[PDB]
């Protein structure tokens, strides 16, 4: 019988392509608050 | 016994510089999914020696159009001044204890710029000239902000003596009360050392090699040794300024180990930054410092004059 | 013994030169793409001590990676002349080797060795990145065989 | 084609040919380092520009 | 269908504005980029240890040329000149005459390896599998003249490489 | 602890190469101290190894012999020293080493592989393989005129 | 890019100048197992674009 | 003395490296080798021709700003004064006038390069 | 694949991705370098009858150009105006 390179019977599994840049990090308020907290401890 | 101490400073500096070239190529390599030098000596440990020997037996060229005396003078100034930057550094004891060590370092940094300007001008070639004039712009960009950043920090130390910074930071690193200045200082040292993303006076992808494009063999090596020596020296300066190591007078070598680790990591950060970012445009560098750092640096300078006075925490003069 | 000393000194300078080969950032056509793949992580030419540098004043090797046309010939000879010595030329690909697919063109130099001396000829169109690396390692073993000081001693 | 087994003429239209011809137009008012960026944004290969 | 790559309006609520102020002042998106290169530092590099390790190839690889024989040892080439006719580079030069036993065989068979474009048309054109491109790619030379192959060189290549060439042809001849 | 298991593997490499002397030989000859399964050896002394836990391209490798065809190759190794039977396996053109699937024997195949001979007295020199085309008249050896 | 050069070399025998697409179709059919390997490459590629 | 000895040693070490660099290697000098570099083609015009400075106004402002820091660097010492009311007022006064001058040059488009 | 757990965690955290699910280095998911032989199909012209070449000869159906005008009512355009593209419903905005 004919034998040549073919996809599997059900096809290949799904393939991602869409952009994915995960959302990380604390908010602006929390980050500024930690910065000021460090400053005040330094000054003291 | 002082001459021995001088040699035990500059021989190690040049050896550390040579192996910083290997470390950079390996660190960049692994960050780039490759290895970097690993064939010349085990783990590439003889690679800096091969390059050094190669360059100093390579034919040095004096360009037909160059100004001979200035062409030779500039690389000599570059390396000479780079080694001079190390003499007041307290590790923990300076080779030369200066009252105004910080001011000395500022002045010598300014003088080292002329090794770029004169080498580029003396080459009498267009890419060399363009590189040198980029150094003029770079110096104009960072120098004013760099001095005022130091001033704000020294208002907590109380003196221009480098060894006092050790005393100042005995309880706590100055990075805590002055991390905004540390941020701006760290960037300024990249610009000061012509390091990426501020590698503009060489700007390989734009100027081929910029100010040193006409230099070959040993004269070129002098410029390379100078820049890499300044990169290490400026991160030692950053460690002393902001990450003060505690000093036990009876175990001075514990200071040296702790301080050496900090300076190394700060130097590794320079390589890390080079691996990560694109290059600035040299007018965009000037706008970064003048339109962002300088307004903030002026404001913080006002704050750090007032803060000791209002908190009754002015440091001792001595 | 003088001979023993110059023999060992030849080994040192030969080792230093082959261990630290800096090609000029010089590419001409398709073959430069395989040259790019030698710098890429799989082969990592940097790990042999092979580093591209843009300036001819700071280059040890010229890899002629692609067709040399008549209009380009004076420029290639110029940047070759501007390399300090010792300097080496690696001819990469059929075009550089002898004209290749364009051998009979009115605008092509039939081999870069009409313009510059060539140390190593890397065949292919293009040579694989590994074939070019084999050519560079061949250049290294040529440098290792040099006898400059030994011949000077017997002058 | 002229009916034989060899082409009579083959003009190649390279997209980078017209793009590079517009480099001067696109670089107006820009600095040297922007011209470096503009060359890359056109995506030029001189195998096709020159033929 | 089409999509817009860069047509979005930033929100102006105080939280979003501060989030952007923290980004501008604390360099958060620059720090994020440092994280990516750090992750690569701790990934195993992709470098192979040439020449002790070799990049992978397939049976179809087009490398150095070689002239082949039948199992008896007779040359397969019968001087038909199809390879010479098809060669896009005119890299092949052939002369032929009746051999002393009357066979149709070449007296010249040259390949200018500095003209050749390693395209494989010659081995497609050959009706008897005489001229092939073998798997060797490590044959760079110190002189130009060493790359002007004559019949003796090409036959020596076939005798040198026949063990690999025959196995490579065995793997791929059913795709031809 | 994993950091301890890592150090154990590093020490197993010194014994896996037959001791510090064997470990240093391979480190300085091949800049790699990994240990693999000996797939086979060829008549010139090249040893072939594999480790299928390594990623594709690093899962096969050769430690070149120190002497081939009268040449000292302790420090001078090159890819042209691999004979054709192992060349196919080393380049992953096949999965089967010549130990398992030996090549078809012919009486005209080289019994002795030769590496790249460029730059040596054994280098190939091109020449025209055809005989002279025009035959010139030879004058008589006698005087008669 | 180096892994995609392998696809070129596996269908044609050349990493770059395949000369594979011809008037009439292609020179040779896909070797067995090639589409599996293209799928493995394509499965991971978008993540590489994300890093870029 | 220690200082002069240290400077002399550094700049002598650099000078020796240059002396070795020039006298140790084998030289082969000819016209084409020493010609000015410009990517393979001969330069068009001298490199001594005027090179326009587009940041000329920032460069002059640098001179004025670079003298301000000379006036400010004594501030750590001035903070030891007993007359801290005057000193703090004059320190803040000087820095503000520096900020005002910066804001003026900024708003008047002095920090933009000439195109 | 040989990274220790802590190192996998570190680089996973630094990049913000799970890097172990899509390693860029190939291991054993790739095809075997030796394959069974193929048996390729034939084309539509592989027949023993009803297969005369003159009925499947594309070249001999090519014709010289139609001369529309030579030098020996509503306005028209070369083709209908192009239909406006629609926005992607997969992801209209990047
Ligand atoms: C450590 C010092 C490192 C610098 C070493 C400089 C000498 C290097 C050897 C060298 O010059 O090359 C060969 C060079 C000759 O090569 P050449 O190509 O045949 O001719 C070169 C030009 O004719 C002449 O060369 P030129 O075009 O460069 O001009 C000559 C010279 C101009 O020379 C003069 O006209 C008078 C002498 C100038 C030096 C005096 C100082 C100038 C006033 C400032 C006061 C400073 C006091 C110290 O130019 C200078 O400005 C000299 C600057 C020296 C700065 C020293 C640092 C202070 O010099 C000779 O050996 C003769
Ligand atoms: C100054 C600094 C230098 C002085 C410190 C010296 C410390 C000793 C270093 C020894 C490393 C040798 C490791 C080893 O046994 O080889 C395994 C290796 C066999 O292992 P394998 O089968 O290939 O698999 C490797 C892992 O599975 C795959 O590799 P992996 O990525 O999974 O790493 C495994 C292991 C490897 O790491 C170590 O064992 C050494 C850790 C030193 C940390 C210092 C920083 O690391 C760990 O298990 C995690 C803890 C390590 C600390 C990680 C923290 C990184 C910094 C945090 C990120 C932020 C940075 C900014 O055997 C060898 O090949 C021996 C080669 C010898 C290499 C040179 C070693 C000497 C280094 C210089 C000594 C001083 C001069
Ligand atoms: C951080 C600094 C790093 C410095 C690294 C220093 C390098 C250390 C390794 C030195 C190796 C020995 C030098 C050999 C290289 C010489 C260059 C070369 O290849 O020439 C080939 C030439 C070949 O010459 P040739 O006669 O055979 O042919 C050339 C002439 N034509 C072109 C016609 C063919 O060798 C020589 O001419 C002399 C070789 C002598 C080797 C001994 C060197 C003595 C050093 C004194 C030199 C005098 C100046 C003083 C310099 C300062 C002294 C230290
Ligand atoms: C100043 C002195 C600096 C000492 C450098 C010593 C160089 C060490 C060295 O040669 O590496 C081993 C090298 C390694 O040999 P190799 O360079 O042929 O290795 C080829 C690459 N591998 C091994 C991966 C296949 O040994 C030599 O080549 C002999 C050179 C001896 C130099 C004589 C010094 C006197
Ligand atoms: C254009 C080409 C240029 C080429 C470059 C050539 C190299 C030049 C390098 C720079 C030259 C300027 C050097 C200035 C040194 C200033 C350093 C300093 O102030 O400290 C040195 C020391 C003062 O110590 P101090 O702590 O301030 O007070 C004494 C407390 N016991 O005071 C001393 O140690 C005594 C120093 C007196 C001699 C100074 C000589 C300088 C003259 C310039 C050379
Ligand atoms: C987010 C990425 C940012 C990238 C930018 C680059 C930043 C890198 C910065 C590197 C330097 C960070 C600090 C390095 C820590 C070194 C630890 C050490 O060796 O010393 C131990 C130290 C405590 O000792 P000590 O400093 O003497 O105490 C202070 C009192 N004066 O430590 C105490 O535990
Ligand atoms: C109690 C009252 C207290 C009062 C005092 C309060 C003070 C604290 C609050 C003030 C704000 C704190 C932050 C100040 C830091 C400086 C911020 C800054 O200057 O960033 C702005 C600058 C410009 O960004 P840009 O978007 O291009 O332009 C803005 C629009 N014109 O952005 C940039 O600089 C971009 C820099 C590009 C080059 C970066 C290359 C390196 C990046 C990695 C470095 C990581 C940092 C490590 C630091 C190590 C320190 C040793
Ligand atoms: C363009 C022109 C801009 C000009 C801007 C000028 C701004 C000046 C702002 C005032 C600065 C000084 O502000 C003033 O400092 C002094 C001391 O330092 C303070 O004085 C306080 O401390 C001092 C001693 O330290 C005591 O003598 C005094 O009893 C006490 O009140 C004042 O309470 C405060 O009002
Ligand atoms: C006491 C020291 C600390 C206080 C700060 C002192 C420095 C003040 C700096 C100038 C402030 C006002 O002056 C400045 O005017 C120009 C108008 O061209 C504005 O600048 C405007 O164009 C430039 C260039 O595109 C950008 O900065 C910005 O996009 C825009 O705001 C600045 O946003 C504003 O800051
Ligand atoms: S030799 Fe082949 S690949 Fe190289 S430049 Fe010429 S045509 Fe392109
Ligand atoms: S591979 Fe192509 S160019 Fe080379 S000889 Fe064969 S047909 Fe000619
Ligand atoms: S096509 Fe084959 S048989 Fe014909 S001349 Fe060429 S090599 Fe010989």
Outline where DSSP puts E strands in chain E: 65-67, 92-98, 104-112, 131-133, 148-149
Task: Note whether E6 and I94 are within 8 A (CB).
Answer: yes
* Sequence-ordered list of residues with C-beta below 8 angstroms from that of B264, at least 6 positions apart, any chain: none
Q: How far apart are CA B81 and CA E165, in angstroms?
A: 64
Q: How far apart are CA B84 and CA H11, in angstroms?
A: 9
Touching check for B37 and chain C: CB below 8 Å?
yes
Q: Distance from the CA of B69 to the center of ligand 1, in angstroms?
A: 4
Touching check for B39 and chain F: CB below 8 Å?
yes
Touching check for C30 and chain D: CB below 8 Å?
yes
Q: What size, in residues, is chain B?
A: 318
Q: How far apart are CA H32 and CA H72, in angstroms?
A: 54
Is residue E97 helix, strand or coil? strand
Outline where DSSP puts E strands in chain I: none
Chains C and A touch (3+ CB pairs under 8 A): no
Task: Note whether C109 and C99 are within 8 A (CB).
Answer: yes
Which of C51, C59, C57 has the alpha carbon at shortest distance from C24? C59
Q: How far apart are CA E126 and CA E87, in angstroms?
A: 11
Touching check for E117 and chain C: CB below 8 Å?
yes
- At C138, phi and psi to the nearest 5? -65, -40
E83 labeled binding residue: yes
The residue whose C-alpha atom lies closest to atom 2 belonging to ligand 10 is: C125
Q: How far apart are CA H12 and CA H22, in angstroms?
A: 15
Residues of C in contact with F57 (CB under 8 A): 42
E122 labeled binding residue: yes
Task: Note whether C25 and C54 are within 8 A (CB).
Answer: yes
Q: How far apart are CA F96 and CA E172, in angstroms?
A: 16
Pairing of strands G21-22, G25-26: antiparallel
Q: How far apart are CA C63 and CA C42, in angstroms?
A: 20
Atom of ligand 8 nearest to the CA of B306: 18
Residues of B in contact with E27 (CB under 8 A): 183
Q: How far apart are CA D21 and CA D18, in angstroms?
A: 5
Which of E122, G16, F141, B280 has the alpha carbon at shortest distance from C35? G16
Residues of D in contact with C29 (CB under 8 A): 46-47
CA of E22, closest CA in chain B: separation in Å? 13
The alpha helices in E42-150, defined as continuous H runs, are 82-86, 121-125
CA of A13, closest CA in chain B: separation in Å? 28
Q: How far apart are CA E81 and CA E101, in angstroms?
A: 20
Q: How far apart are CA C18 and CA B40, in angstroms?
A: 10
Task: Note whether F78 and F116 are within 8 A (CB).
Answer: yes
Residues of D in contact with C30 (CB under 8 A): 47
E121 lines ligand 11 (CB under 6 A): yes
The reported resolution of this PDB entry, expressed in Å, is: 2.3
Q: Distance from the CA of E142 to the center of ligand 3, in angstroms?
A: 26
Q: How far apart are CA H3 and CA H7, in angstroms?
A: 6
Contact F109 E108 (CB under 8 A): no
- What is the chain C residue with the closest CA to D45? C29
Q: Residue C53 has what DSSP assignment?
A: B
Question: How many C-beta atoms surround the C-beta of residue H100 within 10 A?
Answer: 10
The token duo for C134 is: 């084999």
Outline where DSSP puts E strands in chain F: 37-41, 47-50, 60-63, 67-68, 71-72
Tell me the CA distances in angstroms from B268 to B181, B264, B275, E37, F131, one per residue in order.
20, 6, 11, 13, 70
The token duo for E129 is: 């599998």
End-to-end CA distance of chain F: 110
Q: Hey, CA dihedral for F15, F20, F23, F26, is it positive or negative?
A: negative
Q: How far apart are CA C102 and CA E115, in angstroms?
A: 8
Which pairs with CB-CB distance under 8 Å and at least 24 residues apart come from H105-108? Answer: H105/H57, H105/H61, H106/B291
Q: What are the binding residues of C for [4Fe-4S] cluster? A: 30-31, 95, 125
Question: How many C-beta atoms surround the C-beta of residue I94 within 10 A?
Answer: 12
Q: Distance from the CA of H7 to the center of ligand 5, in angstroms?
A: 9
Q: Is residue H2 part of a domain?
A: no
Q: How far apart are CA G10 and CA G34, in angstroms?
A: 8
Task: Note whether C88 and C61 are within 8 A (CB).
Answer: yes
Which of B230, B232, B231, B237 has the alpha carbon at shortest distance from B174? B237
- Chain A neighbors (3+ CB pairs < 8 Å): B, E, G, I
DSSP secondary structure of B95-139: SS--TTHHHHHHHHHHHHHHHHHHHHHHHT-HHHHHHHHHHHHHH
Q: Is residue H94 part of a domain?
A: yes
Q: Is the link from the previous residue into E161 a cis peptide, with omega within 30 of 0?
A: no
Residues of H in contact with B69 (CB under 8 A): none
The token duo for C96 is: 């550089």
E171 labeled binding residue: no
Task: Note whether H113 and H54 are within 8 A (CB).
Answer: yes
Please tell me the total count of domains within chain H.
Answer: 1
Q: Distance from the CA of B231 to the center of ligand 8, in angstroms?
A: 42
| Nearest by CB: F95 against I2, I5, I33 | I33
Which of E155, E96, E83, E163 has the alpha carbon at shortest distance from E123? E83
Q: How far apart are CA B6 and CA B18, in angstroms?
A: 19
Q: Is residue H61 part of a domain?
A: yes
CA of B193, closest CA in chain D: separation in Å? 20
Which of F30, F57, F65, F52 has the alpha carbon at shortest distance from E52? F30
CA of A27, closest CA in chain G: separation in Å? 23
Q: Hey, CA dihedral for C82, C83, C88, C92, is it positive or negative?
A: negative
Q: How far apart are CA E110 and CA E84, in angstroms?
A: 10
Q: Give Cα B173 to chain centroid, integer Å.
A: 21
Task: Note whether G38 and G32 are within 8 A (CB).
Answer: no
- Bridge partners for B299 per DSSP: none
Domain holding H70: CATH number? 1.20.58.1610
Q: Distance from the CA of E154 to the center of ligand 6, in angstroms?
A: 67
Q: How far apart are CA E150 and CA H59, in angstroms?
A: 70
Task: Note whether C39 and C2 are within 8 A (CB).
Answer: no
Q: Is residue H112 part of a domain?
A: no
- At B155, phi and psi to the nearest 5? -65, -15
- Bridge partners for E75 per DSSP: E69
Q: How far apart are CA I35 and CA E171, in angstroms?
A: 8
Task: Note whether C132 and C125 are within 8 A (CB).
Answer: no
E79 lines ligand 12 (CB under 6 A): yes
Region of residue E90 (phi > 0: left; psi between -120 and 50: alpha; otherwise: beta): left
Ligand 8 pocket test, candidate residues H79, H84, H85, H92, most atoms within 8 A of CB: H85
Which of B278, B123, B288, B116 has the alpha carbon at shortest distance from B206? B278
Q: In which order are the strands placed within the sheet that holds F47-50?
A: F37-41, F47-50, F60-63
Which of E36, I27, I89, B84 has the alpha carbon at shortest distance from H3? B84
Q: Is residue H51 part of a domain?
A: yes
Taking the CA atoms of chain B, what radius of gyration do you get in angstroms?
A: 20
Identify the residue among F56, F58, F93 best suited for mutation to test binding to I, counting I beta carbons within 10 A and taking the highest. F56
- Chain G neighbors (3+ CB pairs < 8 Å): A, C, E, I
* Sequence-ordered list of residues with C-beta below 8 angstroms from that of C15, at least 6 positions apart, any chain: B50, C144
The alpha helices in E3-112, defined as continuous H runs, are 14-26, 28-41, 82-86
Touching check for F53 and chain E: CB below 8 Å?
no
Task: Note whether B242 and B230 are within 8 A (CB).
Answer: no
Q: How far apart are CA E1 and CA F18, in angstroms?
A: 65
Residues of H in contact with B62 (CB under 8 A): 34
Q: What size, in residues, is chain D?
A: 51
- At D2, phi and psi to the nearest 5? -110, 15
Task: Note whether F119 and C142 are within 8 A (CB).
Answer: yes
Q: Is residue H78 part of a domain?
A: yes
Which of F110, F109, F85, F102 has the alpha carbon at shortest distance from E73? F109
Residue bearing tokens 């160059």? B66
Task: Note whether B32 and C41 are within 8 A (CB).
Answer: yes
Residues of A in contact with E20 (CB under 8 A): 28
Helix, strand, coil abundance in chain B, percent, nearest 5: 70, 0, 30
Tell me whether residue F75 is exposed, middle or buried, using C-beta atoms within 10 angstroms of its C-beta: 0 to 12, 13 to 18, 19 or more: exposed
Is residue E110 helix, strand or coil? strand
Contact H58 B84 (CB under 8 A): no
Residue bearing tokens 């000029």? C24
Tell me the CA distances in angstroms from C100 to C94, C134, E116, H19, one per residue in order.
4, 20, 6, 47
Q: Distance from the CA of C28 to the center of ligand 10, in angstroms?
A: 9
- Residue H70 belongs to what domain range? 7-107
- What is the chain A residue with the closest CA to E24? A28
Q: Is residue H55 part of a domain?
A: yes
* Sequence-ordered list of residues with C-beta below 8 angstroms from that of B130, at least 6 positions apart, any chain: B207, B210, D32, H51
| Contact residues of ligand 6, CB 6 A cut-off | B 169-170, 173, 243-246, 258, 261-262, 265-266, 269; E 31, 34
Q: Is residue H1 part of a domain?
A: no
Q: Is the link from the previous residue into B197 a cis peptide, with omega within 30 of 0?
A: yes
Q: Hey, CA dihedral for D3, D7, D9, D10, is it positive or negative?
A: positive
The token duo for F94 is: 């096949």
Touching check for C100 and chain G: CB below 8 Å?
no
Identify the residue among C10, C71, C79, C152 best suited for mutation to test binding to H, counting H beta carbons within 10 A and taking the highest. C79
Q: Distance from the CA of B79 to the center of ligand 1, in angstroms?
A: 19
Task: Note whether B297 and B148 are within 8 A (CB).
Answer: yes
Which of F131, H60, I7 has the alpha carbon at shortest distance from E43? I7
Q: Distance from the CA of C96 to the center of ligand 10, in angstroms?
A: 8
The token duo for C70 is: 């008549």
Residues of A in contact with G29 (CB under 8 A): 4-5
| Nearest by CB: I34 against F5, F56, F96 | F96
- Bridge partners for F61 per DSSP: F49
């Amino acid at each position: 019988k004919v034998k040549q390179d073919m996809p599997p019977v059900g096809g290949y599994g799904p393939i991602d392509y869409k952009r994915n840049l995960p959302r990380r990090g604390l908010s602006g308020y929390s980050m500024f608050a930690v910065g000021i907290g460090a400053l005040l401890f330094g000054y003291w | 016994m002082f001459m021995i101490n001088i040699l035990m400073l500059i021989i190690p500096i040049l050896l550390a510089v040579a192996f910083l070239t290997l470390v950079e190529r390996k660190v960049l390599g692994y960050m780039q999914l490759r290895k970097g030098p690993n064939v010349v000596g085990p783990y590439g440990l003889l690679q800096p020696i091969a390059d050094a020997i190669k360059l100093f037996i390579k034919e040095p060229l004096r360009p037909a159009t160059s100004s001979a005396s200035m062409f030779i003078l500039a690389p000599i100034m570059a390396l000479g001044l780079a080694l001079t930057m190390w003499i007041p550094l307290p590790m923990p004891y300076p080779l030369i204890n200066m009252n105004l060590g910080v001011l000395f370092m500022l002045a010598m940094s300014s003088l080292a710029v002329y090794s770029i300007l004169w080498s580029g001008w003396a080459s009498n070639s267009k890419y060399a000239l363009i590189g040198a004039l980029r150094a003029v712009a770079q110096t104009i960009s960072y120098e004013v902000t760099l001095a005022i950043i130091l001033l704000s920090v020294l208002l907590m130390s109380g003196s221009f003596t480098l060894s006092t910074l050790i005393t100042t930071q005995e309880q706590m690193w100055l990075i805590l009360p002055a991390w905004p200045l540390a941020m701006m200082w760290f960037i300024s040292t990249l610009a000061e050392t012509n390091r990426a993303p501020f590698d503009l006076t060489e700007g390989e992808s734009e100027l081929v090699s910029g100010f040193n494009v006409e230099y070959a063999a040993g004269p070129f090596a002098l410029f390379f040794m100078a820049e890499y020596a300044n990169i290490i020296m400026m991160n030692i300066f950053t460690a002393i300024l902001f990450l003060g190591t505690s000093h036990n007078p009876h175990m001075p070598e514990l200071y040296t180990i702790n301080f050496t680790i900090k300076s190394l990591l700060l130097t590794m950060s320079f390589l890390w930054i080079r691996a990560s970012y694109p290059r600035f445009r040299y007018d965009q560098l000037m706008h970064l410092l003048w339109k962002n750092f300088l307004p903030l640096t002026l404001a913080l300078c006002m704050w750090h004059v007032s803060l000791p006075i209002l908190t009754s925490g002015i440091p001792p003069q001595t | 013994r003088g001979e023993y000393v110059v023999a060992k000194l030849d080994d040192l300078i030969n080792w230093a030169r082959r261990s630290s080969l800096w090609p000029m950032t010089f590419g001409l056509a398709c073959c430069a793409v395989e040259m790019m793949h030698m710098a890429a992580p799989r082969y990592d030419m940097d790990r042999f001590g092979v580093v591209f540098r843009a300036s001819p004043r700071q280059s040890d090797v010229m890899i002629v990676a692609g067709t040399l046309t008549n209009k380009m010939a004076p420029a290639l000879r110029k940047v070759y002349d501007q390399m300090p010595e010792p300097r080496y030329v690696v001819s990469m690909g059929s075009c550089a080797n002898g004209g290749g697919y364009y051998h009979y063109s009115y605008s092509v130099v039939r081999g870069c060795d009409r313009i510059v001396p060539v140390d190593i000829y890397v065949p292919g169109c293009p040579p694989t990145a590994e074939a070019l690396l084999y050519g560079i390692l061949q250049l290294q073993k040529k440098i290792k065989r040099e006898k400059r000081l030994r011949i000077w001693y017997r002058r | 084609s002229d009916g034989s087994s060899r082409p009579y003429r083959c003009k190649i239209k390279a997209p980078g040919f017209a793009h590079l011809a517009g480099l001067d137009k696109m670089s107006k008012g820009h600095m040297l380092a922007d011209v470096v960026a503009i060359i890359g944004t056109q995506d030029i290969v001189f195998g096709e520009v020159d033929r | 269908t089409y999509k817009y790559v860069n047509l979005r309006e930033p929100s102006m609520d105080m939280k979003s504005v501060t989030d952007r102020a923290a980004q501008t002042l604390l360099w958060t998106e620059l720090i994020r980029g440092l994280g990516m290169t750090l992750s690569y530092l701790f990934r195993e590099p992709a470098t192979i240890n040439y020449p002790f390790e070799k990049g992978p190839l397939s049976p179809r690889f087009r490398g150095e040329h070689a002239l082949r024989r039948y199992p008896s040892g007779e040359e397969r080439c019968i001087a038909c000149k199809l390879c010479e006719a098809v060669c896009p580079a005119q890299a092949i030069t052939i002369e032929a005459e009746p051999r002393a036993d009357g066979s149709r065989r070449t007296t010249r068979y040259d390949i200018d390896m500095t003209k050749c474009i390693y395209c494989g048309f010659c081995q497609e054109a050959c009706p008897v599998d005489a001229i092939v491109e073998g798997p060797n790619f490590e044959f760079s030379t110190e002189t130009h003249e060493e790359l002007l192959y004559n019949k003796e060189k090409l036959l020596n290549n076939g005798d040198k490489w026949e063990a690999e060439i025959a196995a490579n042809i065995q793997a791929d001849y059913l795709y031809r | 602890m994993e950091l301890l298991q890592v150090l154990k593997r590093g020490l197993q490499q010194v014994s896996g190469h037959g001791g510090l002397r064997g470990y240093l030989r391979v480190l300085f000859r091949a800049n790699d101290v990994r240990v693999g399964t000996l797939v086979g050896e060829d008549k010139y002394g090249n040893k072939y190894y594999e480790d299928n836990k390594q990623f594709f391209g690093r899962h096969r490798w050769v430690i070149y012999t120190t002497e081939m065809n009268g040449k000292n190759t302790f420090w001078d190794v090159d890819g042209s020293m691999v004979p054709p039977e192992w060349h196919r396996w080393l380049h992953c053109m096949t999965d089967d080493p010549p130990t398992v699937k030996p090549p078809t024997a012919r009486k005209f195949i080289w019994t002795n592989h030769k590496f790249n001979l460029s730059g040596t007295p054994q280098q190939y020199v091109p020449y025209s393989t055809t005989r002279k085309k025009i035959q010139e008249w030879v004058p008589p050896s006698t005087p008669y005129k | 890019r180096e892994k995609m050069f392998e696809f070129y070399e596996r269908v044609s025998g050349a990493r770059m100048h395949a000369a594979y697409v011809r008037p009439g179709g292609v020179h040779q059919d896909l070797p067995l197992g090639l589409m599996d390997d293209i799928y493995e490459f394509s499965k991971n590629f978008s993540l590489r674009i994300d890093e870029l | 003395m220690n200082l002069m000895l240290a400077l002399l040693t550094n700049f002598t070490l650099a000078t020796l490296l240059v002396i070795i660099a020039f006298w140790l290697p084998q030289l082969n000098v000819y016209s084409e080798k020493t010609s000015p570099y410009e990517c393979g083609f001969d330069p068009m015009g001298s490199a001594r021709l005027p090179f326009s400075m587009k940041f000329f106004l920032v460069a002059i402002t640098f001179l004025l700003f670079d003298l301000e820091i000379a006036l400010l660097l004594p501030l750590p010492w001035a903070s030891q004064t007993a007359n801290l009311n005057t000193m703090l007022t004059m320190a803040l006064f000087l820095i503000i006038l520096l900020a005002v001058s910066l804001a003026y040059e900024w708003t008047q488009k002095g920090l933009e390069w000439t195109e | 694949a040989s990274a220790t757990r802590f190192i996998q965690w570190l680089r996973n955290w630094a990049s913000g991705r799970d890097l172990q699910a899509k390693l860029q280095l190939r291991y054993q998911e790739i095809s075997k370098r030796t394959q069974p032989p193929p048996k390729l199909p034939v084309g539509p012209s592989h027949k023993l009858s009803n297969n005369y070449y003159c009925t499947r000869d594309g070249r001999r159906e090519a014709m010289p150009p139609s001369i529309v005008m030579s030098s020996q009512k509503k306005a028209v355009s070369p083709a209908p105006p192009i239909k406006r593209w629609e926005l992607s419903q997969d992801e209209p905005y990047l």
